[PDB]
């Protein structure tokens, strides 16, 4: 049909795959879209009803702001932006609440699995903070002893990764093409040998070695890319790849309709 795709391996959290019959700007733009433009959900504004802890308030705000959130159903709601309402209706936002107490004699931790959804969830799978390990605790927030109190009111909104790294799903990326340097898009700094002084790529054996003596294949052109996507976990990885392709084409179609309407 066109740009074929081959999966090398997959997991719960990362995709590694092969992309062929594609051009370089195509692949690179996919990469950047996929690192910057995916809409998601994240906690955005926070009201301290009562702080007592050692830990400072804007730490509590900022470290709140970075907890990843469940965002399968992110497309169902809309931006606070564009929303017909004002001040965080259920149909544009979600509300989070935290409670802590210095109960024990020992220090008590406050994990992400303590904040609870409050507002109308309207049956769409949104907002539950991800627990990656197998021991129930989310990610650590704050510690308390015997007298400190936290009472937090939190509001999440849409947001995208372009204006803040909160709203990223991306978390890493990998990229490689022509591991054998047949395209001569670089030449190696060295002092005895390029071949000896550089480690072989892991993706070398996927293509044949350069056959040693044949002249420079000038007419050739880059293809056959090597991607490894690794999401943070706010959304499954197949979803992030497909949504990135979808939002890139949505962008291009938008520019097309703008042109036709002009």
């Amino acid at each position: 049909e066109g740009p074929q795709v081959k999966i090398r391996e997959a997991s719960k959290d990362n995709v590694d795959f092969i992309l062929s019959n594609v051009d370089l700007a195509m692949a690179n733009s996919l990469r950047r879209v996929m690192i910057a433009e995916i809409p998601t959900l994240a906690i955005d504004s926070v009201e301290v009803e009562t702080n007592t802890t050692v830990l400072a308030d804007e730490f509590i705000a900022h470290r709140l702001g970075l907890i990843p959130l469940q965002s399968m159903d992110i497309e169902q709601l809309e931006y606070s932006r564009d929303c017909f309402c004002e001040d965080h209706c259920d149909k544009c936002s979600v509300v989070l609440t935290l409670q802590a107490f210095g109960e024990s004699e020992s220090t008590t931790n406050v994990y992400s699995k303590d904040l609870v959804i409050v507002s109308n969830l309207m049956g769409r799978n949104i907002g539950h903070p991800i627990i990656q390990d197998k021991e129930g605790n989310g990610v650590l927030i704050c510690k308390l002893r015997k007298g400190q109190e936290l009472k937090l009111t939190c509001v999440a909104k849409k947001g995208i990764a372009k204006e803040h790294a909160k709203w990223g799903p991306a978390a890493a990326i990998e990229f490689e093409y022509d591991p054998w340097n047949k395209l001569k898009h670089t030449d190696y700094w060295y002092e005895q040998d390029s071949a000896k002084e550089w480690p072989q790529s892991k993706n070398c054996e996927y293509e044949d070695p350069p056959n040693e003596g044949d002249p420079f294949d000038y007419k050739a052109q880059a293809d056959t890319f090597y991607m490894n996507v690794e999401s943070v976990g706010s959304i499954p990885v197949d979803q992030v790849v497909v949504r990135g392709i979808d939002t890139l084409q949505k962008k291009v179609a938008s520019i097309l309709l703008a042109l036709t309407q002009m």
């Binding site: 470290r63 605790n137 510690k143 790294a165 890493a172 943070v232």
Partner: peptide, 21 residues
């Protein structure tokens, strides 16, 4: 200070891993 959330370079969540480490 706590462990950071979210490695500054990459973005992978860190902070679950602290007491485990």
């Amino acid at each position: 200070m706590i462990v950071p959330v979210r490695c500054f370079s990459c973005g992978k969540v860190v902070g679950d891993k602290w007491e485990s480490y």
